[model samples]
Structure formats: structure tokens, C-alpha cells
Target chain A: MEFWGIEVKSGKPVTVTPEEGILIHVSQASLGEKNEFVPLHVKVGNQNLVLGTLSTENIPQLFCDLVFDKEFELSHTGKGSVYFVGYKTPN
Target chain B: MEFWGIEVKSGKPVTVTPEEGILIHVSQASLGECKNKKEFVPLHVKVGNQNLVLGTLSTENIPQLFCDLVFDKEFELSHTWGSVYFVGYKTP
Candidate 1:
């Protein structure tokens, strides 16, 4: 399944309220140009969790193993789309 | 809204047959160890739209390789964190 994600601009971070029991898995940090590397950071509340720097040439599958009910943000300083892959209990 | 996806291991690629109308949104790829820098591991996941490099891991669980890619079995959601919430339903 190809997952969609929240669109984040460079230097601007967006926070998302996660659903309980739903695992958030991010696949790729895509950039418009090739051969560019960008640092992607994820935070839980006020804690800095995972920082996965992505490149246009090679986009990897990055997972956010923790689930949050408060709020979390995916911040990056590069121009591109940060892809989010996650799962929830289907109704 | 929150979404979910299959668990994948590094080097071993898997394919997923998604249900129509259901869009797959992958968030992040998880690793066990924390390091200064780890290159992204690309995975092969078959989708209705196209083939996506969706997941990768370094664990040795072989079942994790086949997990969710071919989810022919029934799945049960436990209400550990909270009660059952309805997002959608199918009538069959």
C-alpha cells in the first residue's frame, strides 16, 4: 500500500494528533531536486526522538515506532515532501 | 487521521495488495540502534498506483518478512489503550 502524508514546507514544521493504537511509519522524505540531503526530525511532546536525514537520490523507509495522543511534529529544513506510512484498526 | 502499514526487514523486500479506495500512507522506517547517520533502506511494495519503496528493517524475524504483505488471515484489534472506535464499516 502506498501511503500519503502531511505536507511540510522547509523550515516549517507541522504537528499531528495521532490516534491511539495506530502505528505511524514514514517511508520517504522526497525532494524536488536530486543529490540533496535534508535532516528530518520527529518530536514527542517536548522530547527530540528520531532524526532521519534523507536524500533525494536514496529515500528510505523510516519508522516512528511510538504512538502519541498529545501531539508530534515532523520538522525538516529541506524542500520536499515527507511521506507518512501508518496503520490503524480498520472499522 | 492515523494510518498503518506492514512491517518490513532490511534486504528482504515484500509486496502488498491493497484494498481498493484504501490509500496507503507510510510515516517512518524504524531501526533498533541509534547512530550518527544511517542511510535509508529502500523496500519494494506493490500498490495499485505503482511500486513503492515503502519499508526496511534489520531484524531476523522471518515472519516479519511476510507480515501484512499477504494478510489473508483475520485481524483483531485489542482495546488496550482505549475502547473501540469506528472509522468506517463494510456491509457484507
Candidate 2:
């Protein structure tokens, strides 16, 4: 699997043919900074939690330094994005 | 062993006796609604992240709540509880 554009190997390699298997690329660092990312992924069993690219718009860098050391606020839009990407429970 | 007052069996039974062995009863629920509970248990494994609790007061409840809610909030919390109670992670 590709994590934040970087490849991550977990356990044994997926023996399936690379051509047939779908590839998913992600990056936790640039998730919210770039147009293609989100803010954070605090929930478990969620596709958003892995790379943290699917979450509310409260990206760590979205606000100024005032809120830098503070916790982020979650938005309904970002929450909906997680539901769109995958189900609430693990498959 | 127990979850919210109910007993739960996982894998092989820990036959170390009830009194001698430290039985950690857990229940994912509310802490503030009841007088013998807490508020929450956020963060990984710190002493005091926000006072969800820090092995706070002992009361009439079994396995706490806010600590339970903040814990069951994810599978990771379940894993950490294993480390604290069973393993040698968070020992006082």
C-alpha cells in the first residue's frame, strides 16, 4: 500500500498481481496543506485514520499561530468526507 | 474479565485466581452522568492530559466511564489497557 505517496509494507507482501490490484497513494504530512488533503483522522477503523488525509477542515496549518498549540475544531463537511470514502466500521 | 458489569472471556482464561490477580473490569460509557464516574480519557498514555482521570477516586462503579469512553473511542485504547493492566507498561 502507498502511504502519503510513500510505500509501506505491512506483514507479508500482498501476493496478488500488481496489475490487478488497486493502488492507493497517500501522504499524512501534506494532507491538509495541499488541495488534495484533509485536516486530521482521530477515529479508528476508518480509511481517514491511516494517512490522516480524511477529516474535518481543521488542518493543523489552517489557522494562525494562535490556535497552533490548541486543539482543532471538527467540521461537518470533513466528517462527511470520511463517510464518503469508507464506512464507519472496518470491512 | 468484566465489561460494564458483565464478564467477557478472551482467548484462554487467566487462571491466577480472583483476589491475587488484578482483575481489570472495563465498561465503555459515561462518567459525568453518575456521581462515581469521570469526564473523559483523551490522549495516548500520559499522567494528566486533561483530567479525564488519573486513576482518580475509587467508587461504587466497576471499570470507569470517561476513561472507558475515551478508551473505547478507538481500538488503540484497548491495546494500551492491555499494556497497563497485564503487561508492564503503566504500573503506578
Candidate 3:
């Protein structure tokens, strides 16, 4: 299941919320023409979500790990509460 | 409305799906201690969505500029049909 441009495998779409925060591991993406690197982190909530757009100056080790279909923690958040829901994208 | 790590200003959450896709604009993100930049894009669907994550190989120009907030086309995809729904994110 692919959302936006992030490639999700053949499984259930990982749903999240504020009380259910999530740590995503992206498998590297093209930064358009410049070809710069960019990463993504989304925190879920009951109604809305929080996304952390990582910079492209010095690619992080975590970013490198994302390209190999690795696994990462994707938590959730809601009503001032937060917790790790589950893990997805296991290489 | 803030979903995931992407910041959505004071507005209603823009719902999407294929046949109803969405174009995302990132103001730029920090890639850990190494300090690399990253961007994002997600196509919508009635039941699912597509996310395009950009890399951080360069420090100049945001890889692509077709999606700079004001308006971008997000075409939707359904079991049999598709269409570009709406746009989000507008900087001041």
C-alpha cells in the first residue's frame, strides 16, 4: 500500500494517531532535479498527524538504513497521550 | 491539522486517495546528526495513498518545485476510475 510517494509493501496500511506516534524508515528518495536526499517521519493522532521533514545537508545513518526495506518503530499520539503502536517495513 | 511529521496549518485536514490524489510540499527537514535535507509527496486513494520521499544529495534547489504549496495537482485512483482532487500548504 503506497501513500503519497512512500512505498508501502503488500499489507495493511499502518494507521496512526497522536496518542499513537510512529517512527518511519524511508528507503531513500530522489530530491527531484538537484537529486538531493530527503527523509520523512510522521507522528499520528486521533484526528491529525505530525510529520518531521528531515534536512538534506548530511544524510543521517537512519536514512541510509531506510533504503534496504528495514524495520522501524511507528508510534501514535492522541489527546495529549502517546505510545508506540507497532513496527512496519521489515526488509 | 498536523498529520505525521508534515505541518498542516490552521485548516481542515485535506482528505485524498487515487482519483483524489494530494500534492505535499515540505518546507525542508533535518536528516539527523549528519544534517541532510529531505522532502515528501503523497498520492491519495479512496482506500490508500502513495508517498514519494525525496533525497538530500544537494543543498541547492529542492530537487523538484512542481509542489511549492500554493497549488499542486494530486490525481486520485480508485478501483476503476481516477481524478485530481485538491491541494494543500500555502506559505506566507
Report lDDT per candidate.
0.42, 0.22, 0.27
Provide fnat values for all models in the order shown. Answer: 0.11, 0.00, 0.20
Docking outcome class, model 1: incorrect
Considering lDDT, which of the candidate structures 2 and 3 is the better prediction for this target?
Answer: 3
Candidate 3 per-residue lDDT over residues A1-91, each given as its tens digit: 1222333322223443212333343333232211222323342333233233333334321222222132333322111111111113222
Cα lDDT tens digits for candidate 2, B1-92 = 33223221223222222233233223232122334443222112111222111221112332332221112111122111111232211100
Error of 3 at B41 (Å): 18
Ranking by TM-score: 1, 3, 2
B8 Cα displacement, candidate 3 (Å): 8.2
- Per-residue CA lDDT of model 3 for B1-92, tens digit only, reads 22222322222334432233432333333211224433322222222343323222222332222222211344222111112122334322
Docking class of 3: incorrect
Best by lDDT: 1
**Could you tell me every candidate's TM-score relative to the true structure?**
0.41, 0.17, 0.19
lDDT of 1 at A67: 38
Q: Tell me the tens digit of each residue's lDDT in model 1 across B1-92.
A: 34454433344334443355544333233333434433333334433443333333332321012122212223222111111121222211
lDDT of 2 at A41: 30
User: What DockQ does every candidate get?
Assistant: 0.08, 0.05, 0.09
Residue A81 of model 1, lDDT score: 54
Writing each residue's lDDT as its tens digit, candidate 2 over A1-91 gives 1101111122211111113334321111211111224433322222223224432222321111111111222222231222111001111
